[PDB]
């Protein structure tokens, strides 16, 4: 109970929603024979729905007035109440992966900028170099922090074009 929300393990409307979904899928079932391919497909869909609802009740999600999971996007409020996987852990995951992709692209730009024809290397991508830099970009946070402390990550303003005010 972090903001007037109840856990979906004990909230009644979550179970009501699960029952309604399973009942609708059973209403879909009650038209085919037991061993037909549509019957197997609907049975798989039912199993997936029950597994999803049981997993959501297991993971400790919060449900509001009705049975819909709510996520917490405050560190501390999610850390001490055990919901860091709602926003905080995916925040760290996205920051890592986006930094990996962006650092790989950046290093490709600075690697092909000092070649004979940097114009050609951006439509005709050197695949081994791109693969190597994509691998090297997995250590993007340490490399980026090192280049920031070295001062080689940013460019001086006196070497950057601006408009004449």
């Amino acid at each position: 109970d972090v903001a007037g929300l109840t856990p979906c393990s004990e909230s009644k409307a979550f179970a009501k929603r699960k029952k309604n979904e399973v009942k609708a899928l059973n209403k879909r079932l009650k038209n085919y024979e037991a061993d037909s391919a549509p019957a197997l497909a609907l049975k798989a869909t039912i199993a997936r729905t029950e597994a999803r609802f049981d997993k959501y009740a297991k993971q400790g999600l919060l449900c509001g007035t009705d049975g819909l999971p709510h996520l917490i996007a405050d560190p501390g409020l999610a850390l001490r109440y055990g919901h860091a996987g709602d926003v905080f852990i995916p925040t760290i995951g996205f920051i890592y992966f986006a930094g990996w992709l962006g650092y790989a692209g950046s290093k490709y730009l600075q690697a092909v900028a000092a070649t004979a024809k940097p114009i050609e290397k951006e439509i005709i991508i050197d695949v081994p170099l791109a693969w190597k830099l994509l691998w090297e970009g997995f250590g993007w946070p340490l490399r980026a922090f090192a280049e920031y402390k070295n001062g080689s990550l940013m460019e001086d303003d006196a070497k950057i074009t601006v408009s004449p005010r």
């Binding site: 024809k117 114009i119 050609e120 951006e122 439509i123 005709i124």
Partner: protein
């Protein structure tokens, strides 16, 4: 005069060397993409055979083979 089949034996070689270089068909697309406008113009003038060659024969041959490719896509 006299309707008959006339063709040219082996006009264009079959290889992948022009696949490596985009914008080969038009002279204005040469010397690389200095801007992204080059990238847009490359697709803009891909089928504009009048801007690629001045010969009606080459334009007609390109149109015929493009028709064959479209028929293959439809099939």
């Amino acid at each position: 005069k006299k309707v008959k089949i006339v063709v040219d034996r082996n006009p264009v070689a079959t290889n992948f060397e022009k696949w490596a270089k985009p914008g080969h068909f038009s002279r204005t697309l040469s010397k690389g993409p200095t801007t992204t406008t080059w990238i847009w113009n490359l697709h803009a003038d891909a089928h504009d055979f009048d801007t690629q060659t001045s010969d009606l024969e080459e334009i007609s041959r390109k149109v015929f083979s493009a028709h064959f490719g479209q028929l293959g896509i439809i099939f």
